[PDB]
């Protein structure tokens, strides 16, 4: 709604008499498919893609972040329609600082020049910004109120029947005899991310290749989901975030 329609047709918003909605905050847990979902919308339009970590511009060299965002937006203007994907705003998250060590103060600089750059000043034509982050809990108020922004999308853990659809995509790729045991599988696969479901297909197929069959059978899918569930909580702490 926010990105794809006004870029493709500005015209329908001219009729409604409002300005186009710009700005989305996407937040959720790692391996929840935030890159997937951001990438997906743009790819339809044919729009150019810019993936900039916000911790790869923080050096000890002060003003190193400022300089990099400056050129980044100006290139995007030529590569219109374009959506810049600001990956992590939790590495430049928060407002307080402006004191102590020079890294703390590097955050404010990055933030303060961006505010105008959103705001249209400057001027986002057929450029739109999609913001991705792990932590909306530590975010700047200036860069996270309304009117930076039109929809706050909370993306939880993949749904009870959302994981079922992820199993459909992955189980399509492989050669199999036809399997109908995902019903029990998805129930085993509670609290999992699409990254761990991805792993489960690959694992389920490694067992087939160890047993010397080129086919994914129901016996091996069951193994994948038990073993991943174990090794997921062993090296995890079951992290709590919004």
């Amino acid at each position: 709604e926010v990105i794809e329609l006004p870029l493709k047709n500005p015209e329908i918003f001219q009729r409604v008499g409002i300005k186009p909605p710009k700005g989305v905050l996407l937040y959720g847990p790692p391996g929840t498919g935030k890159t997937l979902l951001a990438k997906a919308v743009a790819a339809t339009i044919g729009a150019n893609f810019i993936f900039s970590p916000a911790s790869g511009i923080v050096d000890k060299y002060i003003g190193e972040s400022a300089r990099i965002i400056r050129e980044m937006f100006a290139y995007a203007k030529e590569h219109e329609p374009c959506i810049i994907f600001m990956d992590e705003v939790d590495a430049i998250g928060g407002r307080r600082f402006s004191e102590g060590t020079s890294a703390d103060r590097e955050i404010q600089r990055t933030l303060m020049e961006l505010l105008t750059q959103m705001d249209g000043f400057d001027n986002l034509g057929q450029t739109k910004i999609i913001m991705a982050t792990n932590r909306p809990d530590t975010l700047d108020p200036a860069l996270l109120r309304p009117g930076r922004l039109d929809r706050k999308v909370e993306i939880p853990l993949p749904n009870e029947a959302g994981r079922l659809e992820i199993f459909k995509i992955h189980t399509a790729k492989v050669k199999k005899t036809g399997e109908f045991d995902f019903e029990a599988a998805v129930k085993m696969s509670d609290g999992f991310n699409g990254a761990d479901i991805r792993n489960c297909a690959t694992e389920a197929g490694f067992f087939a290749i160890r047993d010397d069959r080129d086919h994914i059978n129901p016996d091996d899918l069951m193994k994948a989901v038990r073993k991943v569930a174990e090794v997921k909580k062993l090296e995890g702490t079951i992290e709590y975030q919004k």
């Binding site: 911790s55 790869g56 511009i57 923080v58 050096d59 000890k60 890294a103």
Partner: protein, 52 residues
């Protein structure tokens, strides 16, 4: 291929001064893509080592 310490040709942190080891880091991705130049990665496999 056996690739030694990744604590110096592709640090996570950029609070290390690097400008050419920055470019080594970008080439480490290109290698993984090229192992799909035979399908999968079976023929040309990569092992890698890091100490942190």
């Amino acid at each position: 291929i056996f690739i030694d310490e990744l604590d110096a040709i592709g640090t996570k942190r950029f609070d290390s001064e690097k400008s050419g080891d920055r470019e080594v880091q970008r080439t480490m991705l290109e290698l993984l893509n090229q192992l799909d130049g035979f399908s999968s990665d079976d023929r040309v496999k990569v092992l890698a080592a890091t100490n942190r």
